[PDB]
């Protein structure tokens, strides 16, 4: 069964206490989609993007 | 800071930059004139109106 397998498949991350993540998101149609810019994390070290 | 990459390239050691910033001094001049007859009556106290 699906619901029977649902504990067994998520033997990990499931039921871990949640934290607030700061990140910009958008809404496109019916989908909430996260958006990121990572040029900071590669220009500070002077490595090409 | 730097990044570790799985690529065969040599890792680069820790690095610091030490930067010196220097002052600028600016000079400003103004001029005033005072009459001698003007400075004359300032010391004495008037008696007639």
Q: Do B3 and A47 touch (CB under 8 A)?
A: yes
Torsion of CA B2, B7, B8, B9, to 10 degrees: -30
SS3 for chain A, per residue?
A: CHHHHHHHHCCCCCCCCCCCCCCCEEEECCEEEECCCCCHHHHCCCCCC
Contact present, A43 and A36 (Cβ < 8 Å) = no
Q: Do A44 and B1 touch (CB under 8 A)?
A: yes
| DSSP conformation class of B10 | P
Q: What angle do CA B12, B13, B15 make, to 5 degrees?
A: 110
Give the residue carrying structure tokens 């220097």.
B22
Q: How many CA atoms lie within 13 A of B10 on its CB side?
A: 3
Contact present, A24 and A35 (Cβ < 8 Å) = yes
Way it was determined: cryo-EM
Resolution value (Å, 1 decimal): 4.4
């Amino acid at each position: 069964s699906t619901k029977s397998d649902l504990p067994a498949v998520a033997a990990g991350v499931e039921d871990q206490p949640r934290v607030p993540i700061s990140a910009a998101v958008i809404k496109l149609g019916n989908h909430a989609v996260a958006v990121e810019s990572l040029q900071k994390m590669y220009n500070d070290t002077q490595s090409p993007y | 800071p730097t990044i570790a990459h799985g690529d065969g390239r040599r890792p680069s050691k820790q690095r610091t930059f030490i930067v010196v910033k220097n002052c600028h001094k600016h000079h400003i001049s103004t001029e005033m004139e005072l009459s001698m007859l003007d400075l004359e009556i300032l010391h004495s106290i008037p008696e007639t109106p």
